[PDB]
Design a binder for these strands. Structure first.
Ligand SMILES: Nc1ncnc2c1ncn2[C@@H]1O[C@H](CSCC[C@H](N)C(=O)O)[C@@H](O)[C@H]1O
Ligand SMILES: [Zn+2]
Length: 782
DNA sequence: ACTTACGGAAGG
DNA sequence: CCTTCGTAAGT
């Protein structure tokens, strides 16, 4: 319940949203060259007295006039000018959080006569050096710039605009300026060439040798292995049943018609039965002799099909390899599976994890090879204990982030740049010298990640205007202040999907506006955790930020079928951005089900409290072999104890898909001597406004998926689906951890409520691993 | 320390 | 027009 401790930059950005806020036209000079069409190229000109030059900006009438950064000028004797659009900040995803003097370069350009220019706008390109050591100089320069801008605005003088980033709504973010590709004055525009290449890579182009084509840039050819959409050849938490994956085919022939492709076919284990898909590798295929003639537009990508001997030695949980293996033959007519009677042949960053929790993000990030987890901050004792247990080489501060930040800023001597409450200062002054000597200092942290609390942004929160929820939503400012003070090379933020829509997006827009103020490149997206190898409907919003000299990571490619449409962020002007595709209509791998996740764990009764057990059966599914590994000790296979009435209700729920409280008979039970009603009073009382409370007192489906992991699985909770598919009990701690992708060797601390809170709060380790892989690729790109 | 009671907006 | 996805008050 502490007000966030912030630097003055973040405090100034958020303002009131912070609780603790404190006609003559003539060429100038000679020519310098000619275009490919023999047109002289000039660099300087005069248009009615005002001066136009390559690298400046010009104005066109449109309501505010449009601004165009001049790329080149040339001459019919008609004077011409090519310019790239400079979008204003208010017309971007920033909205009302943008400055009135900042312009963003876009990939849209136009050619216009010099007579159409309304005037010349004072325009500069801003490129400040990056580093924590330039913060004070940047602060002084920004104060001077603000004073000059206010002075000019008082006297009604023309505005002076600056540009430091390029706005990509198609890539969804703000990237670094290609300073070497703009203002060349050579008759060649990079955006024009990019547009031409994008237009070219869209049509059907049969190759010269009549053996392949160029669908969407991909160069398919005969004997290649391709993906085909399965359509071209429900209850709560069970919407993935009936969803099929990509049909893997071999390009056999190019049948002339403007042509068609004749392909063979491969069968997956799930095409035989659901029991065969359970006990089978996710990358297994069956040879068949069925050929289909398809249009060339039905192909969805390329893959490799090997034998079991030539499969890659490295095995990862989040599978990013488009490699399958074929060993058996599926007879379509008989339905049998027989044997086969042309297949295929340093950067670790010192990391600070704020709001660490039990270490779900840190585990995946450091498993990918990009994070060190050198420092962690987590103010809850059980979660900090779990983090220390799972990352023994990490320095964990079990303290408020607003106190750790105050201690860090006070250690560095920047007490005048800290906006903190008296309580934060008093608690920071009460830190022993041992902890104040191991605190991180700016220049030692190259990566800051972590997810601030989402309980104030979640749509479940009925009371999101209370003091507690308003304080929880204020932890964004402390995270941004950590990023501003330390200035790491990379920055990662995770929150709920509703974080981008909360308060009309004003919290989201004010976040990017902060990161852009520090001089970052910011990109945003929304990812579904169930498309990366878990049986869970978990939609999370991610924000990547990088220094101007670094490369922004790409988004991981989902490889599992999941019944979730495209998750779009609304930018502005009716535009939307989807970070990744939707795998509902096809993906390389089949969805993970509940039985694949928790099918092999031994049965336990209600209220089991044995924290140490032994595995009874061996792993069967592909998930169980990957989630257990070499673990021989079963930990935290314990479930919460239900009272007599709740246990009585649980035993009367049928063990069939779609079962919930609607199947409870209407009768009076006697427990003690108390007489109660079997059906809870609150469920039919407000069922009309809550979709009938579907899923409450509901069992999981063996072929479905787990619902969203909450910090307190209850029978009568907004989720509801917490009962075992076959056992009269709630899901154990270990089962809820497996549903989140946690390896069986992971440890949790506290009582059962603390462990459940730890699991329900954590980022799925597979998603963190995928993000870390993308970050590793970005780091190697530099 | 548990158990019950339960609003409304963003996307489709 | 369904389909998602935690905090307070009462024992
Ligand atoms: N002000 C604060 N200072 C430090 N930790 C905080 C905090 N406010 C909330 N937290 C912690 O942040 C955690 C949620 S973030 C979840 C942990 C992490 N994202 C993961 O993937 O595992 C909670 O457990 C809470 O204890
Ligand atoms: Zn151009």
């Amino acid at each position: 319940a502490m007000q966030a401790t912030t630097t003055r930059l973040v405090n100034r950005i958020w303002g009131e949203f912070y609780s603790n806020y404190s006609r003559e036209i003539k060429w100038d000079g000679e020519s310098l060259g000619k275009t490919s069409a023999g047109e002289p190229l000039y660099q300087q000109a005069l248009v009615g007295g005002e001066m136009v030059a390559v690298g400046g900006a010009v104005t066109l009438e449109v309501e505010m006039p449009a601004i165009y950064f001049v790329e080149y000028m040339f001459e019919d004797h008609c004077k011409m000018l090519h310019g790239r659009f400079l979008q204003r900040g208010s017309m971007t995803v920033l909205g009302n959080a943008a400055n009135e003097r900042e312009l963003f370069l876009t990939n849209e350009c136009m050619t216009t006569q010099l007579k159409d220019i309304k005037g010349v706008a004072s325009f500069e390109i801003r490129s400040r050096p990056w580093g924590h050591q330039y913060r004070k100089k940047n602060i002084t320069a920004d104060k001077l710039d603000w004073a000059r801008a206010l002075e000019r605005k008082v006297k009604d003088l023309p505005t002076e605009y600056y540009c430091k980033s390029l706005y990509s709504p198609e890539r969804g973010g703000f990237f670094s300026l290609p300073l070497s590709d703009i203002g060349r004055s050579s008759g060649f525009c990079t955006s024009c060439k990019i547009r031409e290449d994008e237009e070219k890579r869209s049509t059907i182009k049969l190759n010269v040798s009549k053996t392949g084509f160029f669908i969407n840039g991909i160069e398919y050819s005969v004997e290649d292995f391709v993906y085909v959409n399965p359509d071209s050849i429900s209850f709560k938490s069970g919407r993935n049943i009936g969803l099929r994956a990509y049909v893997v085919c071999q390009l056999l022939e190019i049948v002339p018609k403007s042509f068609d492709v004749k392909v063979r076919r491969f069968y997956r284990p799930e095409d035989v039965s659901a029991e065969k898909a359970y006990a089978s590798d996710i990358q297994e295929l069956y040879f068949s002799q069925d050929t289909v003639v398809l249009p060339p537009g039905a192909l969805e990508g390329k893959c490799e099909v090997r034998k079991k001997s030539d499969m890659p030695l490295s095995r990862e949980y989040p599978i990013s390899d488009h490699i399958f293996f074929c060993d058996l033959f599926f007879d379509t007519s008989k339905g049998s599976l027989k044997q086969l009677p042309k297949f295929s042949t340093e950067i670790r960053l010192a990391t600070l994890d704020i709001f660490a929790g039990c270490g779900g993000l840190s585990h995946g990030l450091k498993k990918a090879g990009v994070s060190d987890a050198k420092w962690a901050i987590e103010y809850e004792e059980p979660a900090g204990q779990a983090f220390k247990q799972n990352h023994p080489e990490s320095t964990v501060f079990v303290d408020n982030c607003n106190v750790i930040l105050r201690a860090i800023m006070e250690k560095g001597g920047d007490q005048d740049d800290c906006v903190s409450t008296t309580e934060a200062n008093e608690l920071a002054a009460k830190l022993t010298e041992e902890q104040k000597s191991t605190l991180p200092l700016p220049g030692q942290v190259d990566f800051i990640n972590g997810g601030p609390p989402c309980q104030g942004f979640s749509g479940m929160n009925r009371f999101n205007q209370s003091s507690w929820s308003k304080v929880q939503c204020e932890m964004i400012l402390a995270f941004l202040s950590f990023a501003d003070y330390f200035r790491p090379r990379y920055f990662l933020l995770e929150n709920v999907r509703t974080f981008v829509s909360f308060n009309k997006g004003q919290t989201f827009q004010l976040t990017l506006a902060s990161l852009l103020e520090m001089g970052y490149q910011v990109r945003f997206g929304i990812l579904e955790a169930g498309a990366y190898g878990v049986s869970q409907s978990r939609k999370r919003a991610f924000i990547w930020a990088a220094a101007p000299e670094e490369v922004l990571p790409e988004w991981p490619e989902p490889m599992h079928v999941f019944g979730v449409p495209k998750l779009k962020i609304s930018l502005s002007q009716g535009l939307h951005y989807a970070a990744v595709r939707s795998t509902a209509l096809g993906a390389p791998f089949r969805p993970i089900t509940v039985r694949d996740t928790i099918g092999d764990l031994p049965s336990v009764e209600n209220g089991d409290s044995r924290t140490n057990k032994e595995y009874k059966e061996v792993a069967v599914s592909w998930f169980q072999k990957e989630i257990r590994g070499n673990t021989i000790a079963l930990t935290d296979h314990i479930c919460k104890a239900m009272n007599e009435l709740n246990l009585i209700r649980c035993k009367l729920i049928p063990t069939r898909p779609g079962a919930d409280w609607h199947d409870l008979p209407k009768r009076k039970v006697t427990l003690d001597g108390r007489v109660e009603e079997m059906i809870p009073f609150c469920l039919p009382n407000t069922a009309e406004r809550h979709n009938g409370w579907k899923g409450l007192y509901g069992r999981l489906d063996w072929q479905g998926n787990f619902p969203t992991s909450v910090t307190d699985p209850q029978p009568m909770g907004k989720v509801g689906m917490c009962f075992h598919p076959e056992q009269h009990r709630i899901l154990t701690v270990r089962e809820c951890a497996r549903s989140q992708g946690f390896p069986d060797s992971y440890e949790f601390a506290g009582n059962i409520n603390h462990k459940h809170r730890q699991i329900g709060n954590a980022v799925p380790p597979p998603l963190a691993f995928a993000l870390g892989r993308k970050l590793k690729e970005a780091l190697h790109l530099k």
